Design a binder for this molecule. Structure first.
Ligand SMILES: *C(=O)c1ccc(-c2c3ccc(=[N+](C)C)cc-3oc3cc(N(C)C)ccc23)c(C(=O)[O-])c1
Ligand SMILES: *C(=O)c1ccc(-c2c3ccc(=[N+](C)C)cc-3oc3cc(N(C)C)ccc23)c(C(=O)[O-])c1
Lengths: 8, 231, 231, 8
């Protein structure tokens, strides 16, 4: 499960 | 002319939410071997982000279903789940290879501003990172190394050519930090990069542009959100 | 077995939001020439609704852009907008013809319950109505007549076989009323049908099933919402 | 512009 945010 | 027509078609496809057609229109602009405008780079980036993002979302859903079935041991189901996951992994590879070929054959060689070079090396880092996300063994190590080399090239140009508030520079620092966290499993390096980019922007908030101040501010919140997630 | 496998694949595709694959899985179940289960009819209906619904949304967006450009008189843009609209109209025709062929060749002939016959004639009404929505002249009149004949067949079976609270019967009354409003341009007949279905359900609320009471209640609010919109 | 809701 993701625990990061990238450019979007 | 043909170029304005292709841009208009990209904008129609975007409104219609037909992102394959948006990709195809902007690929034709990229194939002209010219410096893209800000607007054109953004349309290209949105087109591929939507096309890859649908498969990344499907992959995480299918993978989540696979874990659940592994915990129930339903073996009939797992063969079907694994084969479906592998089909999505094939499409992720093809989409990443398509933009990566366009970057290498057209965009990077025709790029002649600091902004455009950072944008394109960053995008190359992003698409090798997407190849690495779902990969194992050798394939994961190869994607991770290509990703790392492109992010370093972008960072070298960004550090000399763009102010620390530039949204392309901040957006590079965000995605590179994510790379260190998710692909290289290094929360310490991820946190250092994200904190350094954030602090360097704070130190020179007088370099904020009228054109991009809200983009810069959003990206600075995303750097802070990762630090929140990672500490 | 093969049938349970195809249903599982449909459910995986649905979770993954890959609706083309969901259609392809449920088409194979429909091609077995057997009475579908409630669950199978629902998976088939959701698959086609998503696939057609993406093109119906694109068509309305493109059409809205066309009106705006007609009001500015941008003729270069209008040729591109019209050609793009026509491409989406081609895909709407192909999708509608695909489910309509499946209904005529497999589902309607194998249907052997009142519920299944109403469901399939209603779906035939819906897909001819979608053919009529964006059509002009002869093509619009032909789609409208095929739609009307299928909705009448569904209504005849629904009136004799299903209680007025049955969600398939209410969902038929909703879509048929929409047909009278949008395709035949008859607010009076649309309002009469929607009010009659609503009132008949109110009169026999003791026929509400434990299984579908919340489906029936939602559809009764949608009938009321159309009456709100149309009066 | 649409002024109707169908089954969805
Ligand atoms: C959420 O983002 C998350 C991260 C990692 C893992 C996870 C795996 C996911 C998918 C896999 N395949 C498609 C084969 C394998 C995974 O292996 C894992 C191994 C570990 N170890 C050994 C500590 C940890 C996590 C994963 C998941 C998950 O769904 O398992 C989720
Ligand atoms: C909203 O749902 C709405 C309904 C109808 C119309 C509208 C037309 C839409 C698209 C058309 N083509 C793709 C060619 C033609 C339309 O013709 C119309 C004609 C009338 N008249 C003559 C009273 C009224 C409406 C339409 C629209 C719209 O976008 O114009 C919107």
């Amino acid at each position: 499960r993701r625990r990061a945010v990238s450019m979007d | 002319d043909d170029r304005e027509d292709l841009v208009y078609q990209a904008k129609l496809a975007e409104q219609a939410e037909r992102y394959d057609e948006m990709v195809e229109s902007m690929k034709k602009v990229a194939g002209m071997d010219v410096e893209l405008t800000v607007e054109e780079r953004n349309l290209l980036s949105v087109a591929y982000k939507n096309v890859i993002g649908a498969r990344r979302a499907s992959w995480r859903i299918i993978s989540s279903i696979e874990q659940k079935e592994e915990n129930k041991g339903g073996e009939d189901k797992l063969k079907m789940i694994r084969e479906y996951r592998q089909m999505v992994e094939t499409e992720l590879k093809l989409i990443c290879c398509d933009i990566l070929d366009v970057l290498d054959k057209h965009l990077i060689p025709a790029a002649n501003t600091g902004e455009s070079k950072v944008f394109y090396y960053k995008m190359k880092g992003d698409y090798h990172r997407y190849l690495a996300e779902f990969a194992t063994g050798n394939d994961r190590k190869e994607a991770a190394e290509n990703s790392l080399v492109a992010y370093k090239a972008a960072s070298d140009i960004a550090m000399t050519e763009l102010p620390p508030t530039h949204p392309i520079r901040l957006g590079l620092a965000l995605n590179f930090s994510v790379f260190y966290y998710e692909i290289l499993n290094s929360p310490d390096r991820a946190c250092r990069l994200a904190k350094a980019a954030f602090d360097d922007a704070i130190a020179e908030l007088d370099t904020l542009s009228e054109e991009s101040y809200k983009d810069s501010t959003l990206i600075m919140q995303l750097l802070r959100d990762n630090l929140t997630l990672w500490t």
